[PDB]
DNA sequence: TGGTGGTGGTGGTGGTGGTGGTGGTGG
């Protein structure tokens, strides 16, 4: 927790040494070193603390991670591979951004996303008709505007050269992967 | 060929020399691989299961909604085994068992072991400890939604414990699968129901505790409530149907129904008359039941009462109905 | 963070204090030539290349320019984004849209002025 | 009659939990 991290930050400066797990647990108000160990591990997994041989190696962030691709046209293979990061604020985008995707195709030209761009997605599964979403249809991803009714869902284009893609929920699997929130272009 | 015969014999000798006598044999010669079953307390359900009961040395799972009757079913199962001389244990992770109601369904309350663990790991450790002993024939775990991990116990509310109980359950099944079959014990897990958020198509209900038990079980049952049983203007029981949603010892997907009467358990004699009709051993002369050329009653209640008061016909019907199905 | 340029009045540079919308910490190294500052636009005139109303266009400030590049400039001391095509003594700023028409104003009457290139686009508007 | 001198890392585990009621019509 943030308070636990602060306790190490000032205790180490005040005394010159980090507090023991027993001391942290006692300050937390519970009779178990596990209380301190859980928070120390959580901070370490966050990348804020280092651990070696059961002891802290030190008390020593890269921005949105680019994860994979997405297709404006026909669906494209879904496979996560974190190839790199970009240093940009989550606060810029309307709901906070979670990761970036690379766009191929031209089926959303009118709204303003085109080939080779980066699209910021906000992770969620609650969405409604008329929004811009990301969907997986049998291990293949597409970005389009949603229109759900009955047992069939329509994924509409935003370019007059492309025609809508329709999937029947009784034959193919459909999971919504998030909600688009913006774009970054550097080409 | 002649060379292959001796080449295989030497390998079998080596394996039996290293890992012990019986580490390999012809599948048609191992009598430890035969299946044995024990009754479940309700005749319709034994017919549905195919083999005639629940298998020993295996894992069984029973899940359903609330006030559905899956503790009475398990106490009914316990009761029959004790009548045959088998020792039993019951593990109440939920902290909700009533001793007297167990005594009143038929259970010998002075010989049934009981534990109330403070952590799921402790419950599973006790399960393994009794399985290794070779002296307990039936274990029951009151609920899996209550098996809390130790890390979750010592923490605070609101902490994230993503996927920890599932990992614990996988480890547990992995470690118990062998001891159960070696000791020939039956382990029954009861489970609850929750909802899947954001599902687009299909049935949203699921169970808690992960995916491992869906694989490692031999039999899974679904138990639900249908209606009320009226002794008059006041309710005196429930109507139940069970489904066999999984089965590794017989054909799956069958069904079964019966009544649970508060304070007594399943009414066997109510099942007997229904099975007799369906099998032409009992005559329904319209609104009137009939048997062997005589008139019986004006309804199911009268028929079962008459049968109860008349052991001769009850035995005659039961010992024939058992044979066909 | 990097400064943001909003509405621009005449007689002062783009980065004048009253033109500063705020600071948004965006790393300047992401773009081909280092981005110096950002500038809000009404991009109805550059749709076909993917610029819209309300989006932000990153600029690396420099007066040097060549043919075929997209440049931020001023004519009549008014800010505009458009591509540059040079005839010689005459130069024209051009659109990338289906309804707009060139700008070839006379330097002797009103001269073009460059402030920087356009390196990339960022947006956060409603979808 | 008298002892020298250290090599080289290996492999991931597991899923959670549903929320909320609109609007009268004809002699
Ligand atoms: N002590 C009791 N006396 C009379 N009836 C009981 C008693 N306990 C349970 N019942 C009834 O038996 C029916 C099924 O309840 P149980 O099987 O005992 O519990 P369950 O349905 O398996 O699980 P939960 O705790 O209700 S979610 C219900 O109609 C109960 O009202
Ligand atoms: Mg119960």
Tally of CB atoms within 10 A around B83: 11
| Pairing, β B194-195 against β A118-122 | unpaired
And the tokens for C96? 């990338």
Cα B55 from Cα B36, distance rounded (Å): 6
Cα C32 from Cα A51, distance rounded (Å): 39
Give Rg (Cα) of chain A. 23
Nearest to A101 by CA among A164, A47, A181: A181
Cα B152 from Cα B159, distance rounded (Å): 8
And the tokens for A91? 């606060």
CA distance A71 to chain C (A): 17
Q: Is B238 in the pocket of ligand 1 (CB under 6 A)?
A: yes
Look at residue B125 and give its three-state secondary structure: helix
Nearest to A158 by CA among A103, A110, A104, A106: A110
A101-130 residues touching C, CB cutoff 8 A: 109, 111-114, 117
And the tokens for B284? 């329904």
CB A184 within 8 A of CB C120: yes
| Method of determination used here | cryo-EM
B213 CB contacts (<8 Å, ≥6 apart)?
Answer: B59, B61, B144, B169, B173, B189, B191
Cα A59 from Cα A53, distance rounded (Å): 15
Q: For B129-133, which contacts have Cβ atoms below 8 Å and span 24 or more sequence positions? A: B130/B89, B130/B185, B131/B176, B131/B179, B131/B180, B131/B183, B131/B185, B131/B187, B132/B179, B132/B183, B133/B183
- Provide φ and ψ at B82, rounded to 5°: -65, -35
In which element (H, E) is residue B199 found?
none
In which element (H, E) is residue A31 found?
none
Extended strands (E) in B3-92: 37-38, 54-55, 59-63, 88-91
Chain breaks in chain A (C to N over 2.5 A) after: 60
Cα B230 from Cα B238, distance rounded (Å): 9
**CB-based contact (8 Å) between A48 and chain B?**
no
- Provide φ and ψ at B279, rounded to 5°: -105, 10
B122 CB contacts (<8 Å, ≥6 apart)?
Answer: none
Nearest to C43 by CA among C76, C10, C14, C70: C70
- The answer to whether the CB atoms of A38 and B155 lie below 8 A apart is yes
Which atom of ligand 1 sits closest to the CA of residue B68?
A: 21
How far in angstroms lies nucleotide D27's C1' from the CA of residue A153?
49
Cα C20 from Cα C5, distance rounded (Å): 5
Cα B314 from Cα C117, distance rounded (Å): 98
| Pairing, β B219-230 against β B255-261 | unpaired
Helix axes A33-45, A2-15, angle to 10 degrees: 100
Nearest to B89 by CA among B97, B66, B121: B97
CB B94 within 8 A of CB B146: yes
Compute the distance from residue B70 Cα to the ligand 1 centre, in Å.
Answer: 8
And the tokens for B226? 């249908």
CB C30 within 8 A of CB A86: yes
CB B242 within 8 A of CB B223: yes
B188 CB contacts (<8 Å, ≥6 apart)?
Answer: B54, B59, B60, B61, B62, B74, B77, B138, B139, B140, B141
Cα B191 from Cα B64, distance rounded (Å): 7
- Provide φ and ψ at B278, rounded to 5°: -50, -25
CA distance A185 to chain B (A): 32
Experimental resolution (Å): 2.9
Cα A11 from Cα A29, distance rounded (Å): 17
Nearest to A148 by CA among B204, B198, B197, B196: B198
Q: Is B44 in the pocket of ligand 1 (CB under 6 A)?
A: no
Tally of CB atoms within 10 A around A153: 23
Helices (H), B120-203: 120-133, 150-153, 164-183
Burial environment of residue B6 by CB neighbours within 10 A (0 to 12, 13 to 18, 19 or more): exposed
Which chains touch A (3+ CB pairs under 8 A)?
Answer: B, C
DSSP code for A123: -
Nearest CA to ligand 1 atom 14: B69
Helices (H), chain A: 2-15, 21-28, 33-45
Tally of CB atoms within 10 A around A170: 9
**CB-based contact (8 Å) between A32 and chain B?**
yes
Chain B residues with CB under 8 Å of A125 CB are 197-198
Cα separations in angstroms, B37 against A69, B40, B275, C56: 55, 9, 21, 74
Look at residue C32 and give its three-state secondary structure: coil
Chain A residues with CB under 8 Å of C124 CB are 92-94, 181-182
Chain B residues with CB under 8 Å of A32 CB are 154
- The answer to whether the CB atoms of A169 and B200 lie below 8 A apart is yes
Q: Which ligand is nearest to the CA of B70?
A: 1
């Amino acid at each position: 927790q943030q308070e636990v991290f602060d306790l190490i930050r000032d205790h180490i400066s005040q005394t010159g040494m980090p507090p023991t797990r027993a001391e942290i647990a006692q300050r937390l108000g519970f009779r178990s070193p596990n209380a301190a160990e859980e928070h120390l591990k959580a901070l370490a997994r966050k990348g804020v603390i280092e651990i070696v041989s059961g002891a802290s190696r030190g008390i020593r962030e890269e921005g949105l991670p680019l994860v994979g691709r997405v297709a404006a046209g026909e669906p494209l293979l879904a496979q996560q591979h974190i190839e790199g990061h970009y240093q940009v604020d989550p606060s810029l985008f309307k709901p906070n951004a979670d990761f970036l995707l690379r766009v191929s195709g031209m089926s959303m030209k009118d709204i303003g996303i085109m080939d080779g761009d980066l699209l910021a997605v906000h992770k969620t599964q609650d969405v409604r008709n008329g929004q811009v979403v990301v969907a997986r249809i049998d291990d293949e991803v597409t970005v389009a505007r949603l229109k759900k009714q009955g047992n069939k869902v329509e994924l509409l284009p935003e370019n007059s050269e492309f025609k809508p893609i329709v999937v029947d929920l009784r034959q193919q699997s459909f999971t919504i992967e998030g909600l688009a929130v913006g774009v970054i272009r550097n080409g | 060929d002649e060379n292959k015969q001796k080449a295989l014999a030497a390998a079998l000798g080596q394996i039996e020399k290293q890992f012990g006598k019986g580490s390999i044999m012809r599948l048609g010669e191992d009598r430890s691989m035969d299946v044995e079953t024990i009754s479940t307390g309700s005749l319709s359900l034994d017919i549905a299961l195919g083999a005639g009961g629940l298998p020993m040395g295996r894992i069984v799972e029973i899940y359903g909604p609330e006030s559905s009757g899956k503790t009475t079913l398990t106490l009914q199962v316990i009761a029959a085994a004790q009548r045959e001389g088998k020792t039993c244990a019951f593990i109440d992770a939920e902290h909700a068992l009533d001793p007297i109601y167990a005594r009143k369904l038929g259970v010998d309350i002075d010989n049934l072991l009981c534990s109330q663990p403070d952590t799921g790991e402790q419950a599973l450790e006790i399960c393994d400890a009794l399985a290794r002993s070779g002296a307990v024939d039936v274990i029951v775990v009151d609920s899996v939604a209550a098996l809390t991990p130790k890390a979750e116990i010592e923490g605070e509310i609101g902490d994230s414990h993503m996927g920890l109980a599932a990992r614990m359950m996988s480890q547990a099944m992995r470690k118990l699968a062998g001891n159960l079959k070696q000791s020939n014990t039956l382990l029954i897990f009861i489970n609850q129901i929750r909802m899947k958020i954001g599902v687009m198509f299909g049935n949203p209900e699921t169970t808690t505790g992960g995916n491992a038990l869906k694989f490692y079980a031999s039999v899974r049952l679904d138990i639900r409530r249908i209606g009320a049983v009226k002794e008059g203007e006041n309710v005196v029981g429930s109507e139940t149907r069970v489904k066999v949603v999984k089965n590794k010892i017989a054909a799956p997907f069958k069904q079964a129904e019966f009544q649970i009467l508060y304070g007594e358990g399943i009414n066997f004699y109510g099942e007997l008359v229904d099975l007799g009709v369906k099998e032409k051993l009992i005559e329904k002369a319209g609104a009137w039941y009939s048997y062997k050329g005589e008139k019986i009653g004006q309804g199911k209640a009268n028929a079962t009462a008459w049968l109860k008061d008349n052991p001769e016909t009850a035995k005659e019907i039961e010992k024939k109905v058992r044979e066909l199905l």
